[PDB]
Amino acid sequence: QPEPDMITIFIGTWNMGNAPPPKKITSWFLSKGQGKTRDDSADYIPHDIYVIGTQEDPLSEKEWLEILKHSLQEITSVTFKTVAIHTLWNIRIVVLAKPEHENRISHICTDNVKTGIANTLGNKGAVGVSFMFNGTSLGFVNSHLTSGSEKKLRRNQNYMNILRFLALGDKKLSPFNITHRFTHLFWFGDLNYRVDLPTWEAETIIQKIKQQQYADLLSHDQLLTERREQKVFLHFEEEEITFAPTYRFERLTRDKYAYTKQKATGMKYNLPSWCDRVLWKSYPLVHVVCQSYGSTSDIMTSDHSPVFATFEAGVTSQFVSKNGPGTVDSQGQIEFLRCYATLKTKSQTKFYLEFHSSCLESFVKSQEGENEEGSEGELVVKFGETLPKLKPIISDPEYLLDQHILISIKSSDSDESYGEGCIALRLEATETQLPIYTPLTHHGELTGHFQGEIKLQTSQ
Numbered sequence: 001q002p003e004p005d006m007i008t009i010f011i012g013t014w015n016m017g018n019a020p021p022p023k024k025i026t027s028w029f030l031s032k033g034q035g036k037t038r039d040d041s042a043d044y045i046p047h048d049i050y051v052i053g054t055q056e057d058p059l060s061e062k063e064w065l066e067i068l069k070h071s072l073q074e075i076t077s078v079t080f081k082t083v084a085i086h087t088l089w090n091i092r093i094v095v096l097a098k099p100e101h102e103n104r105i106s107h108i109c110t111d112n113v114k115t116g117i118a119n120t121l122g123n124k125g126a127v128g129v130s131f132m133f134n135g136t137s138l139g140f141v142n143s144h145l146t147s148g149s150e151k152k153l154r155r156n157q158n159y160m161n162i163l164r165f166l167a168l169g170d171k172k173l174s175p176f177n178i179t180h181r182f183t184h185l186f187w188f189g190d191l192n193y194r195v196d197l198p199t200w201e202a203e204t205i206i207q208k209i210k211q212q213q214y215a216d217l218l219s220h221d222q223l224l225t226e227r228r229e230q231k232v233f234l235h236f237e238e239e240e241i242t243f244a245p246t247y248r249f250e251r252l253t254r255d256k257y258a259y260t261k262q263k264a265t266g267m268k269y270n271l272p273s274w275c276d277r278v279l280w281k282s283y284p285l286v287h288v289v290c291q292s293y294g295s296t297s298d299i300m301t302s303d304h305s306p307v308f309a310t311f312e313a314g315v316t317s318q319f320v321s322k323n324g325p326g327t328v329d330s331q332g333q334i335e336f337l338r339c340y341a342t343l344k345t346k347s348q349t350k351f352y353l354e355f356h357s358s359c360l361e362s363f364v365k366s367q368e369g370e371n372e373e374g375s376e377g378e379l380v381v382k383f384g385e386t387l388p389k390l391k392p393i394i395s396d397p398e399y400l401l402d403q404h405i406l407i408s409i410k411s412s413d414s415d416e417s418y419g420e421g422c423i424a425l426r427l428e429a430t431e432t433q434l435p436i437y438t439p440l441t442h443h444g445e446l447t448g449h450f451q452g453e454i455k456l457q458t459s460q
């Protein structure tokens with residue numbers, strides 16, 4: 001029975017508004033309603049992995065697991081295995097997989113981050129799950145960020161605290177936060193970004209939604225505008241939104257947006273908004289295609305509609321050769337030529353690199369580079385031809401070209417990372433000097449660049 005080279009992943013996000021669900025929620029798992037929807041001809045075909053994020057979830061873990069498993073069994077006739085379930089307050093993530101994947105899944109990690117301080121600590125934050133699927137790392141984050149049209153800066157701060165402090169994936173990757181630890185990272189939830197238009201435009205906004213004319217609303221979506229200005233979710237993707245705003249509805253219909261200020265809302269307006277979102281970030285040149293992104297029309301127990309997204313995602317097998325794992329394969333090498341880092345830092349310490357990869361027995365520390373002044377005020381750290389030759393565990397090009405090298409640039413004085421990036425080994429050629437590039441980030445913010453050339457030797 002062959003190992004897959006592709007899987008399909010369902011991502012769901014639903015703020016349940018502290019209400020039990022209705023008896024039927026199958027439309028959610030089938031990607032039916034508004035937006036980019038799944039073809040009817042696929043309805044019996046199970047996804048490989050279902051990841052369900054809920055917010056304001058009033059159910060026990062047991063109660064929700066029963067509803068999810070029975071939902072998927074009715075759809076697919078498959079009894080899904082529970083990979084992980086993790087709850088922080090009323091924020092929950094559930095990972096379910098086809099039984100045929102049970103022995104493909106390992107290294108399951110769960111964590112949560114509570115956001116805010118005092119007043120603002122007690123119900124917002126994130127839960128997450130990570131695991132290996134054969135040779136591929138997968139990470140999943142469900143976050144409920146700060147509410148309120150006038151708190152986009154707080155939401156961006158929540159994002160940075162979640163990606164700094166959520167402890168998922170391989171702890172040996174110590175310089176790297178979750179935005180570098182996974183082949184595929186899915187981040188979803190009630191991100192709570194609003195359509196930033198005047199309160200007096202509420203009925204105009206409703207009109208536009210009834211006409212399915214979303215262009216002038218999306219141009220004011222705080223998540224799209226904040227992402228465009230590189231304030232949040234740097235280097236994440238999102239599919240185009242072609243579904244109505246998922247918030248704020250009157251319960252038990254989808255016919256009415258309830259936007260007016262009420263004591264129940266702290267006298268705040270809730271203009272129609274795309275609160276409920278799915279984004280992702282995959283390593284360079286790994287196959288990831290969004291095949292649905294939409295909202296249900298028939299689940300109305302909450303003031304939010306459920307959102308679905310599905311993805312094709314490239315996966316690799318757990319590779320064994322006569323040599324690695326357990327030794328190097330002398331027929332393989334990774335060389336870096338003419339490499340330099342450009343850092344936004346004002347500091348004057350020496351810097352060294354760390355190369356981390358599951359194609360190495362352990363990470364590799366370089367010698368210090370040579371600092372020069374850049375023409376426009378920057379620090380340029382030159383490595384020239386000084387970088388250590390990396391010794392992969394397996395030389396087979398069917399393995400090695402699918403791998404990635406994570407790069408950290410660290411201060412010699414403090415050993416702290418100033419920047420983290422990732423280089424794909426999916427090169428146009430082997431035994432050939434080829435340009436490489438990655439931006440560098442720290443706490444998910446741009447801190448500089450790493451560029452140079454690579455020369456990859458495989459056994460072919």
Ligand SMILES: Cc1nccn1Cc1cccc(C#N)c1
Binds near residue numbers: 098099101102103106
């Ligand atoms: C195969 C195995 N033995 C111990 C732990 N695992 C990984 C695991 C745990 C729970 C659910 C799944 C699935 N699906 C996989």
